[PDB]
Design a protein around this ligand. Structure first.
Ligand SMILES: CC(=O)N1CC[C@H](Nc2nc(Nc3ccc(N4CCN(C)CC4)cc3)c3ncn(C(C)C)c3n2)C1
Length: 307
């Protein structure tokens, strides 16, 4: 066969199995709800988020593309769809990520986040992305806002509203118009609308910068139309205060002009894993030693060695 059959199950869930309990988020697109899912006859209550959007035939087409992608992934560091409800406007049903997105989380808990948590998040995000790359999937909107927190110890990548699947012999995605976030975009993406796993790596680099600065805005103040010019001249995001040159050098590499010179996600996993073994040698954080939220230099556990 040209390509491999996608045999994922799309699950359809009766409206009467859910119970919206509270708006969680709203704006633009639609709103996201917190709820409970109680499958029929089972004795189980599953905390869920329910994501919708008035009915426009343009919207439903796009939310179903998103369900398609979310239903095709299965990994501890990715959010998968639990199912869809076919109400007048189609709802996506996902597992509830109780602590919200990671951007707001690091802003809110700035003063209580130790280096161990920061480096572990980098390892986990890299594992999710490496998985998405295994599934031949280019995310195209990786950012701190699109990483969610199941616990402070455990995060997952979300938001496949722009994700694209690539043939077994296709190696780029050539996009069109439509608002993409320029400040997380690789250079090739901004000049040529080309996207690859390697341009996800660039976006990974920006996301890591967001975390290290406890939630700063990339090129704060700068109008998007300028970014391509800044980047072309050779400018990048500044080294975060807590960052050793070891860590910042990794961010810089994710931002090479030559996309094949950037690190692979499976390398990002290895490098950050090693740093996670001695956190304080790589991030310098005032008060690090006592923080709480609810030669073997080269040793890597096999679980983190992925080839
Ligand atoms: C950037 C943006 O527009 N967002 C990010 C969050 C939301 N999308 C979302 N949220 C989920 N859960 C959640 C959300 C906020 C909290 N609190 C509420 C109380 N605040 C003091 C602190 C945070 C708690 C939980 C969520 N769970 C699963 N998903 C799916 C769609 C992956 C979620 N999406 C919309």
């Amino acid at each position: 066969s040209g390509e491999a059959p996608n045999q994922a199950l799309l699950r359809i869930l009766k409206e009467t199995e859910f119970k919206k309990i509270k708006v969680l988020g709203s704006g633009a697109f639609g709103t996201v709800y917190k709820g409970l899912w109680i499958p029929e006859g089972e004795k189980v209550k599953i905390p869920v988020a329910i994501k919708e959007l008035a009915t426009s035939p343009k919207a439903n087409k796009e939310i179903l593309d998103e369900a398609y992608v979310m239903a095709s992934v299965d990994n501890p560091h990715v959010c998968r769809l639990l199912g869809i409800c076919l109400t007048s406007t189609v709802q996506l049903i996902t597992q509830l990520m109780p602590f919200g997105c990671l951007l707001d989380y690091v802003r809110e808990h700035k003063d209580n986040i130790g280096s161990q948590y920061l480096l572990n998040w980098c390892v986990q995000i890299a594992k999710g992305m490496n998985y998405l790359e295994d599934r031949r999937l280019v995310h195209r909107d990786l950012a701190a806002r699109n990483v969610l927190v199941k616990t402070p110890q455990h995060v997952k990548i979300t938001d496949f509203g722009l994700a694209k699947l690539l043939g077994a012999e296709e190696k780029e995605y050539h996009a069109e118009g439509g608002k993409v976030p320029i400040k997380w975009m690789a250079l090739e993406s901004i000049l040529h609308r080309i996207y690859t796993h390697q341009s996800d790596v660039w976006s990974y680099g920006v996301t890591v910068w967001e975390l290290m600065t406890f939630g700063s805005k990339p090129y704060d103040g700068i109008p998007a139309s300028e970014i391509s010019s800044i980047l072309e001249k050779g400018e990048r995001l500044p080294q975060p205060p807590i960052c050793t040159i070891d860590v910042y050098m990794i961010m810089v590499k994710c931002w090479m002009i030559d996309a094949d010179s950037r690190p692979k996600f499976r390398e990002l996993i290895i490098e950050f894993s090693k740093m996670a073994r001695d956190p304080q040698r790589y991030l310098v954080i005032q008060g690090d030693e006592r923080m709480h939220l609810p030669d073997m230099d080269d040793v890597v556990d096999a679980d983190e060695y992925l080839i």
